[PDB]
Amino acid sequence: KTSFGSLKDEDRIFTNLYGRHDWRLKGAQSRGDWYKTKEILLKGPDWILGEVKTSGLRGRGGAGFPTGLKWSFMNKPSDGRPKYLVVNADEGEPGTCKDREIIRHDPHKLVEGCLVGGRAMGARAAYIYIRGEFYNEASNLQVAIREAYEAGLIGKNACGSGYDFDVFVVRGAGAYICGEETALIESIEGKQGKPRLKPPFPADVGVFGCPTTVANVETVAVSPTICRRGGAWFASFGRERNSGTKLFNISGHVNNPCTVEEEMSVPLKELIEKHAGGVTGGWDNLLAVIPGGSSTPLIPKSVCETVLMDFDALIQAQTGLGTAAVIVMDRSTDIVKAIARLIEFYKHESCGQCTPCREGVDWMNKVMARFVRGDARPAEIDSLWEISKQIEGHTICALGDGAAWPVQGLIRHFRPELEERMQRFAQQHQ
Amino acid sequence: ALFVHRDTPKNNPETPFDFTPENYKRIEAIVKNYPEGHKAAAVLPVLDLAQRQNGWLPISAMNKVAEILQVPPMRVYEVATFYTMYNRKPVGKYHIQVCTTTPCMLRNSDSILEAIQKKLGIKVGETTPDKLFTLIEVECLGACVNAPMVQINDNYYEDLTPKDIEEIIDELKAGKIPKPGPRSGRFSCEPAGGLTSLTEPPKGPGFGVQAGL
Amino acid sequence: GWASTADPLSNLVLTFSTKEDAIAFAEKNGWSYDVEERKVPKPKSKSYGANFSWNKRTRVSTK
Numbered sequence: 001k002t003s004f005g006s007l008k009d010e011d012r013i014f015t016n017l018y019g020r021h022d023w024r025l026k027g028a029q030s031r032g033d034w035y036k037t038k039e040i041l042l043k044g045p046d047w048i049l050g051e052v053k054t055s056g057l058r059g060r061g062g063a064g065f066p067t068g069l070k071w072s073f074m075n076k077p078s079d080g081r082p083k084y085l086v087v088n089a090d091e092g093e094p095g096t097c098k099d100r101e102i103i104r105h106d107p108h109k110l111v112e113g114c115l116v117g118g119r120a121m122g123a124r125a126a127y128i129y130i131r132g133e134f135y136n137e138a139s140n141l142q143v144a145i146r147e148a149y150e151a152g153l154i155g156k157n158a159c160g161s162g163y164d165f166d167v168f169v170v171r172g173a174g175a176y177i178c179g180e181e182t183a184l185i186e187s188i189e190g191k192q193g194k195p196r197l198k199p200p201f202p203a204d205v206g207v208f209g210c211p212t213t214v215a216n217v218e219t220v221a222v223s224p225t226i227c228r229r230g231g232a233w234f235a236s237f238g239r240e241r242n243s244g245t246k247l248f249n250i251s252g253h254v255n256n257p258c259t260v261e262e263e264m265s266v267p268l269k270e271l272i273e274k275h276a277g278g279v280t281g282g283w284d285n286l287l288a289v290i291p292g293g294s295s296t297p298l299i300p301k302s303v304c305e306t307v308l309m310d311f312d313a314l315i316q317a318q319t320g321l322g323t324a325a326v327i328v329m330d331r332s333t334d335i336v337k338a339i340a341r342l343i344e345f346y347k348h349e350s351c352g353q354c355t356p357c358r359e360g361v362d363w364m365n366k367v368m369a370r371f372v373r374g375d376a377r378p379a380e381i382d383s384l385w386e387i388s389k390q391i392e393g394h395t396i397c398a399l400g401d402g403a404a405w406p407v408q409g410l411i412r413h414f415r416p417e418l419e420e421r422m423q424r425f426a427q428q429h430q
Numbered sequence: 431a432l433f434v435h436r437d438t439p440k441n442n443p444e445t446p447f448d449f450t451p452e453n454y455k456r457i458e459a460i461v462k463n464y465p466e467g468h469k470a471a472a473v474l475p476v477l478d479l480a481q482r483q484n485g486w487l488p489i490s491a492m493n494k495v496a497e498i499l500q501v502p503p504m505r506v507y508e509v510a511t512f513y514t515m516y517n518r519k520p521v522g523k524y525h526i527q528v529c530t531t532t533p534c535m536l537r538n539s540d541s542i543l544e545a546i547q548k549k550l551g552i553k554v555g556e557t558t559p560d561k562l563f564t565l566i567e568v569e570c571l572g573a574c575v576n577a578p579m580v581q582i583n584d585n586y587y588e589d590l591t592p593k594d595i596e597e598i599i600d601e602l603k604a605g606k607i608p609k610p611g612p613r614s615g616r617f618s619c620e621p622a623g624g625l626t627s628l629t630e631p632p633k634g635p636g637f638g639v640q641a642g643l
Numbered sequence: 644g645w646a647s648t649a650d651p652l653s654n655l656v657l658t659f660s661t662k663e664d665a666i667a668f669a670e671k672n673g674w675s676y677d678v679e680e681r682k683v684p685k686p687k688s689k690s691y692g693a694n695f696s697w698n699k700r701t702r703v704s705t706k
């Protein structure tokens with residue numbers, strides 16, 4: 001196919017996304033959930049991983065790793081230790097609230113995804129790490145898990161298969177760095193949420209020292225629909241190596257911010273003008289677009305017109321898809337203040353274990369505050385770029401890269417505004 | 431905003447504190463939830479339970495959590511200081527947290543803040559004289575498509591106007607609990623100007639399952 | 644109360660590449676010598692995964 005977008009309503013995986021049906025077991029089973037799951041559990045982990053590999057499903061957390069290879073990293077014999085599948089539901093990334101809607105409205109899809117993923121790698125039990133502030137969503141998930149346990153779907157002889165399974169929920173304590181998989185693994189174990197170094201990878205040494213596979217909410221909940229509908233159906237959408245459907249959160253200076261399921265290769269402008277109502281003041285009132293939240297650099301209107309919102313095309317556009325969160329800023333926005341607020345958010349949310357992030361994020365916060373006040377020199381700006389090059393690639397986890405990227409994008413795409421601001425401050429105050 | 435404890439008369443290790451027996455049963459359920467030999471993994475939830483017994487964490491729940499779980503108290507100190515959910519100071523009965531990250535700052539959360547100062551007469555991090563409300567500024571709470579937004583205790587109030595949050599304050603002053611949902615024309619996350627998708631009925635079970643399942 | 648001394652050899656430090664030339668130089672000038680062998684540290688076996696064991700005491704308490 002050449003023109004993408006405009007996903008059909010019958011091909012949308014996440015039905016009852018807006019909460020227009022019942023979220024309990026009766027509403028879940030009347031929409032197509034928990035159908036022939038016993039055959040899925042009986043056909044074998046190799047068959048399940050083959051169906052995942054045929055679909056071409058990639059990591060929806062924000063890194064875009066192939067889910068088939070990562071899930072096949074556990075296809076090894078047991079060594080006297082159990083195996084665990086952990087579903088990441090921290091949701092600390094600004095601009096992204098799709099997994100909150102998935103948990104609050106369709107929890108049984110997530111539970112069936114946990115069971116299918118646990119059988120797919122021989123996991124003894126599943127843990128779900130939810131945010132501390134998501135008390136009502138955690139309570140809804142607990143109600144759904146209790147109704148699944150009481151109906152014999154999971155527990156002893158789960159879904160009439162002979163392979164037992166347990167699903168747990170562990171509530172967080174309000175930390176963004178706990179969204180990282182190794183910091184999440186450490187936070188489950190009662191330690192502080194500080195990430196580990198890889199190697200050892202979590203597939204070898206994870207939670208409690210046992211083998212552990214950490215996966216996003218939507219890349220887990222899609223898997224029952226992958227195993228039921230088929231590999232070719234899920235691989236038909238989008239370009240090659242970018243297959244599937246994605247939940248896009250459009251927010252910012254838009255008339256109707258929302259969360260919408262769409263095909264992968266939908267253009268940005270078409271998606272905004274169709275599923276969100278367009279930018280206030282017209283499309284020509286657009287100034288900047290953040291494509292996937294705080295972990296990717298912004299792009300201007302000159303490139304946003306003809307860009308494709310998948311991994312490869314946005315990587316070619318010197319940015320990243322990330323969590324697919326379209327933040328929109330129009331021409332009436334002080335984007336220096338927006339990047340300063342983003343860097344201050346990173347300053348307030350940083351685990352501080354490894355020193356380059358721990359010092360350079362506060363350094364960037366001070367430099368951005370001086371830039372907002374305009375008390376800066378032009379020769380400082382390139383130095384700031386060099387500071388980013390001392391953070392990107394020298395950190396334990398990827399929060400340092402996610403801190404260096406928005407400043408690099410802001411400099412690269414809006415240097416004349418920064419020079420104008422500092423020249424204006426120098427002309428006025430001196 | 432301090433990470434060192436000083437021995438105050440209100441907050442001392444000799445302050446009386448204990449779990450209720452129902453809280454002890456919940457603590458034992460949380461302990462049984464985890465594998466044997468790793469009871470320290472129950473440090474994070476059980477201490478949370480202690481907050482739900484008090485609303486704030488003195489330095490007696492830290493030592494108590496260390497006593498039941500047989501962990502050193504300094505690990506409990508590290509856990510309670512690393513995370514921002516634990517109130518290590520006595521907060522009010524209603525804990526207002528306003529989000530001011532970029533997707534919420536773009537949709538004018540500053541008007542909501544200025545309404546809070548102009549209504550209650552306290553600064554950020556300042557308490558009311560009757561210890562009923564405490565206003566703090568927080569990061570993103572995962573309600574970005576419903577910006578602007580605040581949270582109170584465990585409830586979310588999204589798509590707020592200054593008049594709406596003032597009315598929320600007066601309704602809380604009457605003692606009634608508000609409705610934790612978006613206050614605009616939308617319900618949870620749908621577009622306000624009609625539904626873009628999901629208007630067709632769901633297709634039910636058995637829709638296009640692969641052969642040989 | 645300055646440090647008044649009487650030894651002229653109190654600040655004599657000589658550097659040799661290995662032991663045998665030092666012994667030869669010490670016996671060449673008739674100086675009776677005490678020789679101490681070098682103490683090479685043992686090559687340890689450092690594992691980062693040992694802090695995250697499952698059935699061992701090497702589980703760290705904090706990081």
Ligand SMILES: NC(=O)C1=CN([C@@H]2O[C@H](COP(=O)(O)OP(=O)(O)OC[C@H]3O[C@@H](n4cnc5c(N)ncnc54)[C@H](O)[C@@H]3O)[C@@H](O)[C@H]2O)C=CC1
Pocket residue numbers: 059060061062063064065070073091092093096179181201202203295296320322323398402
């Ligand atoms: N979803 C969200 O809320 C947020 C997402 N992100 C995104 O998260 C990403 C950073 O996270 P990571 O998962 O660490 O990125 P990536 O560098 O690590 O790796 C992707 C996945 O592949 C696995 N992997 C790669 N090579 C492996 C190997 N040889 N053996 C075993 N496993 C291997 C990793 O364990 C990981 O689960 C960024 O792309 C960032 O944009 C960032 C912030 C928030």
Ligand SMILES: Cc1cc2nc3c(=O)[nH]c(=O)nc-3n(C[C@H](O)[C@H](O)[C@H](O)COP(=O)(O)O)c2cc1C
Pocket residue numbers: 058059060061062063064065088089090091092093176177178179180181182214215216217219397398399
């Ligand atoms: C600082 C940081 C925060 C992250 N936060 C989340 C998160 O909140 N939710 C999530 O699913 N992934 C988050 N990730 C990505 C995870 O490392 C990992 O990609 C995810 O748990 C599973 O990835 P997958 O989609 O390939 O299975 C974060 C990564 C980093 C570096």
Ligand code: SF4
Pocket residue numbers: 177194195350351352353354355357358395396397398399400
């Ligand atoms: S980059 Fe920052 S958040 Fe990540 S491990 Fe280092 S100090 Fe912690």
Ligand code: FES
Pocket residue numbers: 093094095096529530531532533534535569570571572573574577579
């Ligand atoms: S930016 Fe405010 S809820 Fe996410």
